[PDB]
Amino acid sequence: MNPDLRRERDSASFNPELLTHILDGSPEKTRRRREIENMILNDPDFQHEDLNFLTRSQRYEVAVRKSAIMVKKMREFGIADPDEIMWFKNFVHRGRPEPLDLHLGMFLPTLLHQATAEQQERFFMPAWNLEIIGTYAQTEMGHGTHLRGLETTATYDPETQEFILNSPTVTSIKWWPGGLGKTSNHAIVLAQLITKGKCYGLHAFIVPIREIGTHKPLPGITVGDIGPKFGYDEIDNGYLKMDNHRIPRENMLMKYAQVKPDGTYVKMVFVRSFLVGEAARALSKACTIAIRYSAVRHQSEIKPGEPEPQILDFQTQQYKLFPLLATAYAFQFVGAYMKETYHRILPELHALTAGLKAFTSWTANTGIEACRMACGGHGYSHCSGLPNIYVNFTPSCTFEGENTVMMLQTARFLMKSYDQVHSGKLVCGMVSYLNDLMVDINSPESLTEAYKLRAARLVEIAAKNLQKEVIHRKSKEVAWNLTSVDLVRASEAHCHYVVVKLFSEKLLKIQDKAIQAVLRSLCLLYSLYGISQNAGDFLQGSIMTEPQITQVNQRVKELLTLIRSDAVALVDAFDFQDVTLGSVLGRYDGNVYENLFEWAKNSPLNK
Template identity: 50%
Template sequence: MAEHGPAINVLDYETGHHFSNLIMARDSHPFELHYGMFLPTLRGQGTDEQQEKWIPLALIRAIVGTYAQTELGHGTNLRKLEVTSTYDPKTQEFVLHSPTVTATKWWPGGLGKTSNYAIVVAQLWTLGKCYGPHPFLVQLRDLETHQPLPGIKLGDIGPKLGFNANDNGFLIFDHLRIPRDQMLMRHAQVLPNGEYVKPAHSKLGYGTMVYVRSMMIGDQGLQLGIAATIAIRYSAIRRQGEMVEGQGEVKVLDYQTQQYRIFPQMAKAYAYIFASTKVRDMYTKNMKLMKSGNVSLLPELHALSSGLKAVVTWEVAQGIEQCRLACGGHGFSQASGFPELYAQTVAGCTYEGENIVLLLQVSKFLVKAARQVRSGEAALLAEVAEYLGVVGANRSTFSQSQNFSDKIVIEAFEHVARRLVFSALDKLDHLRGEGVGPEEAWNRTSVELCKA
C-alpha cells in the first residue's frame, strides 16, 4: 500500500536537510506520494542526468508523480510482481504490460485523479531473461488534457477506512512503450543493445522503502503524542466520582488507573520520535556511503527500520485506542479526534510492508547475527546486534526494592532479547537436524522468530 502520513518531509541526503515540508489534515493529501516517494526515488535511484532533467520539474510540480509498486495480487512479496517491462533493442524502448487482473497496480496515493507521472516497479526483461523488479519513470496522463495516455487504464479505488482525501488508485498497462532512458539507472542499467549491467549490491534498490519506513516511525510517534495530549487534557478537565465522600468529584486524571493508562503513551511518543531521528541519521549516512559503492550499513539500516516500523505502528495503534477508552463515551465521538486519528495510524500496520512479514525479515538478520556469535565471529556484528555477542549473557539480579538505573533496565531487555533469539535459533536448527526442509523449518519457527 502506498505511503500515507500527515506531514511529509523530503530529505536531501547529501546535506541532511529537508527541502520540502507538507503539513496537511489528518485525512491525507493528494501530493503525499509526490513528495514522500516520487521525489526521494528520483534522488536515490536516478542517474545524475535523470535527476537534472526530472527533479526540477517535480519540485515546481510541472509534473506530479506517485510510486506504483503494490499490485492487486502482490504487495510485500516484490519478487512475484507481475507487471513486465520488456526491452526492445530495435527501438530502444521498454514495453510495459499488465498480463493478468492481479497485475493491476493497486493503492498508489495520488494515482486516482492527481498524478500525471509514476515511478512504476516492474519485472525487467531483456534479451529473453528476467532480472527482477526495477523502477521505471512512466508518463500516465496527457500534460494538457490530463486524460490517460493510450495503453493506460487508471482510476480511483474508492473509499477506505481513512485517508479519503488521498485518491488512491489502480493502474493497468496494455503494451505501453517508454524510452530506454526512463528506466532509473543509478544502480542497474540496460545498455542500448539490451545488455544488462547489474548493480554493485542487490539491495541498492531498497532505498525508497527504507526512507519511507524511517519517516513513518517519527510520524507515528507524533500521532500517538496527539492522542495522549487529547486524553490528558480531557482527564484534567473531566470530573467523575468522589474519592472522599462529601468532598466533591475529582479530576479523572487523579485516579492512578487513568495515569497508568495514558502517561506511558506520552512517554512512548517521545521515544519513537527520538528513535526516528536516529534512523534518519543512519539513512543519510547510508546514502552518502552508497554513492561511493559502500553498502556495509544497508543490512543494519534495513533491519532497524523494518523492525521499528512493525513495532511502532502496532504500539501506536494500541496506544491510541487506550487514549480513546480513557476518555469514556466522549472518545467515541468524531469530535474527539480519535476516529480519524486511529484510522490513519492503524493503516501503518499494513502499508510499506505488512508488520508480521517485516518482523520475519528482521528475524533473518538476527538469525544470521546469532550464527556469527556461535561461529566465533562476534566481532563482525553490526552495532544494533552487538548485545547478542555479550559473553555470559550478563544477568542483573533484581529485587522489588532496587532502584533501576537506565543501564540495568537496558541490560535486562538485552538479556530477554538474547534468550529469545538463541532459543528460536535452537528450534530452527533442531528441526533442520530432524530432516525438515529449510522453508518448512522457518515456517514452524515463525512464531518464535516474530517474538525474537
C-alpha cells in the first residue's frame, strides 16, 4: 500500500465499513453486493483487453458477449432480485452501458406488465431465452422531446387485420435506440395510430425487424448503426426505417386502448429515480479517483525549503474536490430517499422526480470534469478512467427528458402550486413552504430554512414575471416562453433546497456518532458552498446580510481543513473495486507510477 494512503486511512475519524452499510442500506446488502461482485471479479468469461485499446467494432463484440454469458450466469447462480441483477450488471460492465440494456430494461418488463396474456404466450419466453431480442424505438431523427410531432404511423387495415408501420420521411426514421443497429430482431415502436380515417395519437407496437436465426432484415425494414458518439462505443445505437411494414393487429400494446377487428378505437419515476442514483454513483467514482490521486500526487511547494506536499494539501485542490465529495454524498441520500418513497407512493412526485433528474445529472456532469481537470495531465489520459466516466454519464442530461424541459415541467408544478396558494388553498409536501408568502451557519436545520426562503423568492419572481407577460403578450405560451429562464431558475432553487433538506434530515437517523459527525461536516460544506456560489440569491430579499456571507465564506475554508484528514476514508466508503473505477490514478493501493508505466508500455502504438 502507498504510505500516504495507509497514513490517510489510519488517521480517519470514523469506520468507512459502517458508512458503506449506510450507503447500501444494511450490512446484509453490503455482504450480498460484495458476494455478487466477488462471484464475477476472477471469472475469466468477464475478462478482456483494456477497452480503450480496441476499435469500436471490437468493443461492441466484447460487450455483447459479456451481456450474453452474464444473462446465463445470473440464471445459473439463481440471481433474480432486481437489486441483485443490478449489482451483477454494474460489476460485469465496469461503468460502460451494455447492449441488452433495452431488452432486459424495457422489452421484457413491457411484456410482463403492459402486454396481454396471448402476447406473453407468443413473446415472453422467446424473449427471456434471448431467442427474441427487443428494443424500444421512440425517438426519430426529427423528434425526441415533442413526441406529439413523431411522424411514424401505424395504420389499421381491416381487410387483413394488420397494422401497417411506416417511416414516411427521412426525419421519421427511428434514431438512437440502444440495441437497434445490430443486436435486436424485435422493437417496440411508438407510432401515431390511424384507424378509420382518424388519428388517435401515440401507441406502442411490437415490430419484428429481423428473421430469428438468420438475423436478416425483414422485407420493408432498413436498420443499422447511427455511427460513433462521444461515448457509448459498446452500444449499437440504431436507426429503423419502415416501408409500410405489416404486423398483426394483436401486436399493438392495448393496456389503456384497443382496436377491434373492424377498426373501432376504444378510449417514468422509476427511471428518473434510477438516474439520480446514477448521478450520485458517477460523481462518487470521479471523487474517489481524484481524491486518492490527490493524496498520492506530490507537486510544487508550500514551505519553501520543504519537500513537495501531496497536492490535496493545497486549499485550491480541496476547494475543487471537497464540495464535490459533499455533493456526491448528498446525491447518494437523495437517490436512496427517492427509491424508498417510490415504493411508498403524485403531481408533486412527477414534478419532483423530473427536476431532481435534471439537477443531479447537470451537477454530476460538471463534477466529473472538474475531477478530471483536478488530476492535471494524467487526468486527460485514459489511465485516469475519468474520460470514460464522463462520456458514458453525460447523455443522462439529454435522454429520459432533456434537462431544460424537465426543469420547465418542474416549473409548471411550482406555478400551479403558487396559484393554488394565492387563491387561498393549502399545498402539501416539498412545496408546503409556499403557504408562508437570522441564519445559524452550523445548523443544517437553519441552512435548510435559508434554502427554503431562496426558493420561495425565486418561485414568486417567476410567478410575477409570468403574470406580467400573460397580461402583455399575444399568447399565454409566448408569456411562458419569455419567462422560461426565470422558471428554470425557480425549479433549480426548488431542487437545491430539496437536496439540502433531505441531506440535513438524513443526519438525524445516523446511529454511529463519528459517521454522523463527518456527514454533518459534508452537509454543512454542501449547504455553505451553495450559499457562497449563489450569494446574490441570499443577499436579495435579505435572507442573509453581507457580513453573514463573509462568515459563510470563512466557514467553507475551515470545513475544507476539517474534511482533509477524512477525505480518503470517505471515498473508500463508496466501496468501488479497482475494476469498477478502471483507473491507474485511483487504485485502492495508491501504487500509481509503476502501474502507469506498465499500462502505457502495453498500449497499442507500442506493438
